[PDB]
């Protein structure tokens, strides 16, 4: 069907997210799918190396691209640093979403699915 693309978001690191501990980890979310990266412990600067695949996926309806910074403070309650919500479109793109305290960056590859295009691949 019509606006479907293979969404991959990647390249996830952050900056100046604070002599304060950060232990970090994020929670990115699409068209209801979840994915958590492992926590970088003791870092204000942490880079992680996952790929979060969503597979095939509505790029006009999926709701936002939705990411959250949360800080899991030696293991004791969870903090929520920040987030931030993105309109994914066709293509290769870079954002950066700023916090209280520094920012949170990644990319994300949106391929439409063969013999569509456009920006939501309703072409």
Do not use: I
């Not at 403070?73 to 209280?100: K, Y």
């Amino acid at each position: 069907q019509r606006g479907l693309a293979h969404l991959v978001v990647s390249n996830f690191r952050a900056e100046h997210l604070a002599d304060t501990a950060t232990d970090a980890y994020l929670k990115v979310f699409f068209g209801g799918q979840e994915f958590r990266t492992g926590v970088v412990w003791n870092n204000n600067n942490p880079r992680w190396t996952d790929k979060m695949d969503f597979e095939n996926v509505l790029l006009s309806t999926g709701g936002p691209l939705r990411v959250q910074v949360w800080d899991a403070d030696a293991g004791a309650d969870d903090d929520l640093l920040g987030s931030c919500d993105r309109s994914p479109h066709s293509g290769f793109h870079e954002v950066t979403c700023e916090l209280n305290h520094g920012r949170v960056k990644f990319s994300y590859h949106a391929k439409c699915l063969p013999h569509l295009t456009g920006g939501t691949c309703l072409e």
